[PDB]
Amino acid sequence: LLEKLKKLEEDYYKLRELYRRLEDEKKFIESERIRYEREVRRLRSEVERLRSPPLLVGVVSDILEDGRVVVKSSTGPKFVVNTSQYINEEELKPGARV
Amino acid sequence: LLEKLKKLEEDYYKLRELYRRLEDEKKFIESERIRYEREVRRLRSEVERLRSPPLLVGVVSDILEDGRVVVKSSTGPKFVVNTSQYINEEELKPGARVALNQQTLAIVNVLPTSKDPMVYGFEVEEKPEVSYEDIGGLDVQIEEIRE
């Protein structure tokens, strides 16, 4: 009766005060999401600038165990190059057109 | 009594549900935030590494008593380049294939010698699957060579 109604009131009151503040907090997190999305698109534009020509033929002369691959240009310089993770030097083998 | 306590209760129930439904909605938006977040770190990092300038090859062809090392570069032409201090002059000999900077052309690393025309063309790839326990009848032959 009077005991019961006081209890469900205490719950609905308490849950409210908690949930309003969580909502307001997370209101701002929506904006934060827009910020990151844009920055992902910007960086994906850079990935593409690489992919574009002018592109030049190399053939792998050797692989050095230290984190560089000795690759001879068809223009003429052999050079030691540091890979990324988009391609790897695992993919590369000796005599490999690149 | 019972009317009064319930009328309070009703309105508290209505507005709790409202706030509750938007918290869940913007919760999904937060998980989305996490996903983009990872992508920003990742795309950036890997792009940077290839931008990084690579170093040219040269072969110490002459060495000088002025601290200068004449290195014939892989461009073709021959150059007089000055060694650094990460690479010493008692750490260099003529005939040593060495690494020169792309942008200043100074000896900045060593790349032993000679590594051509293919040092995997020599063959040094993959240890063989035979062992002494997988051979029998050549007992005598093993002993001498093993030792």
Residues in chain B within 8 Å Cβ distance of A33 = 29-30, 32-33, 36
B71/B77 Cα distance (integer angstroms): 9
Supply B43's token pair. 């795309």
A97: left (phi over 0), alpha (psi -120 to 50) or beta: beta
Q: Are B55 and B102 in contact (CB under 8 A)?
A: yes
Q: In a 10 Å sphere around its CB, with 0-12 CB exposed, 13-18 middle and 19+ buried, how is residue B28 labelled? A: exposed
Per-residue DSSP letter, B20? H
Q: Smallest Cβ distance to A33: which of B29, B54, B102?
A: B29
Which residue spans within B11-52 are E strands per DSSP?
none
| B99 closest CA partner among A94, A84, A82, A75 | A82
**Which of B103, B62, B55 is CA-nearest to residue B79?**
B62
> In B, which residues are within 8 Å of A68 by CB distance?
54-55
Concatenated DSSP letters of chain A? -HHHHHHHHHHHHHHHHHHHHHHHHHHTHHHHHHHHHHHHHHHHHHHHHHHSSP---EEEEEEETTTEEEEEESSS-EEEE---SSS-SSS--TT-B-
Q: Which residue in chain B has the smallest CA separation from A16?
A: B16
CA distance A89 to A67: 9
Q: Which long-range contacts (CB under 8 A, 24 or more apart) does B127-136 make?
A: none
- CA dihedral over B120, B122, B128, B132, signed as positive or negative: negative
Structure determined via: cryo-EM
Min Cα separation B56/chain A (Å): 4
Is the separation of the CB atoms in B47 and B39 below 8 Å?
no
Say which DSSP state B95 is in: T
Residues facing residue B80 across a β-bridge: B70
Using the CB atoms, write b or e for A25-38: b if 16+ within 10 Å. Answer: ebeeeeebbeebbe
- Please tell me the distance from the alpha carbon of residue A42 to that of residue A38, in angstroms, as a whole number: 6
Chain A residues whose beta carbon lies within 8 Å of the beta carbon of residue B6:
5
Q: How far is A98 from chain B (nearest CA, A)?
A: 14
Report the alpha-carbon distance of residue B102 to residue B108 in Å, rounded.
Answer: 10
Integer-rounded Cα Rg, in Å, for chain A is 30
DSSP at B83: B
Residue B7 · residue A5 · CB < 8 Å: no
Q: Which residues of B touch A39 (CB under 8 A)?
A: 36, 40
Are B73 and A77 inside 8 Å of each other by CB? yes
Task: Please give, rounded to a whole number of angstroms, the shortest distance from the CA of A41 to a CA of chain B.
Answer: 9
Q: Kind of pairing, strands B97-100 and B55-63? A: antiparallel
Task: Select from B2, B52, B119 the Cβ nearest to the Cβ of A82.
Answer: B52
Q: Which amino acid is at A23?
A: E
Task: Enter the resolution in angstroms.
Answer: 6.9
Alpha-carbon gap, residue B147 to B136, rounded angstroms? 17
Q: Residue B109: which H helix or E strand, with range?
A: strand B107-110
Residues of B with Cβ-Cβ distance to A80 under 8 angstroms: 54-55, 57, 99, 109, 111
